[PDB]
């Protein structure tokens, strides 16, 4: 599913995303705009064989399973195909470990690169939430 804007920062809201670890609403949703375009099926090879999956493309190198990334861990203990479905939870579930692991959002490079100090409030201006 493609998702809206507005759309999927509700559905981040509800799911507890909003100033989770002290990151406010907008910083999710620039992030997934960057990541995957708002597209929970999309999918990305990384060089060292491992793939990144979903709105928030997550890696098989540590977080989820997908029988092809040998010697990976599965932290978030879930098949990465659960990561492309229409319903966020799983992503969501998986996005706050990560977030909780040390580094914050510095995990996801568009973040870093493209989000991180700008006025991220934009990304939901004009939405009813
Ligand atoms: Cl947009
Ligand atoms: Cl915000
Ligand atoms: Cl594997
Ligand atoms: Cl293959
Ligand atoms: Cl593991
Ligand atoms: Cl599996
Ligand atoms: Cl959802
Ligand atoms: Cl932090
Ligand atoms: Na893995």
Same mark, same amino acid.
């Given at each position: 599913?493609?998702?809206?804007?507005?759309?999927?920062?509700?559905?981040?809201?509800?799911?507890?995303?909003?100033?989770?670890?002290?990151?406010? =609403?907008? #910083?999710?949703? !620039?992030? +997934?705009?960057?990541? *995957?375009?708002?597209?929970?099926?999309?999918?990305?090879?990384?060089?060292?064989?491992?793939?990144?999956?979903?709105?928030?493309?997550?890696?098989?190198?540590?977080?989820?399973?997908?029988?092809?990334?040998?010697?990976?861990?599965? =932290?978030? #203990?879930?098949? !990465?195909? +659960?990561?492309?479905? *229409?319903?966020?939870?799983?992503?969501?579930?998986?996005?706050?470990?990560?977030?909780?692991?040390?580094?914050?959002?510095?995990?996801?490079?568009?973040?870093?690169?493209?989000?991180?100090?700008?006025?991220?409030?934009?990304?939901?201006?004009?939405?009813?939430?």
């Amino acid at each position: 599913k493609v998702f809206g804007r507005c759309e999927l920062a509700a559905a981040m809201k509800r799911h507890g995303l909003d100033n989770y670890r002290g990151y406010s =609403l907008g #910083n999710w949703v !620039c992030a +997934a705009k960057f990541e *995957s375009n708002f597209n929970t099926q999309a999918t990305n090879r990384n060089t060292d064989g491992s793939t990144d999956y979903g709105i928030l493309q997550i890696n098989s190198r540590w977080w989820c399973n997908d029988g092809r990334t040998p010697g990976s861990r599965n =932290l978030c #203990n879930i098949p !990465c195909s +659960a990561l492309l479905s *229409s319903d966020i939870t799983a992503s969501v579930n998986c996005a706050k470990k990560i977030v909780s692991d040390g580094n914050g959002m510095n995990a996801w490079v568009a973040w870093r690169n493209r989000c991180k100090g700008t006025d991220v409030q934009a990304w939901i201006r004009g939405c009813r939430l």
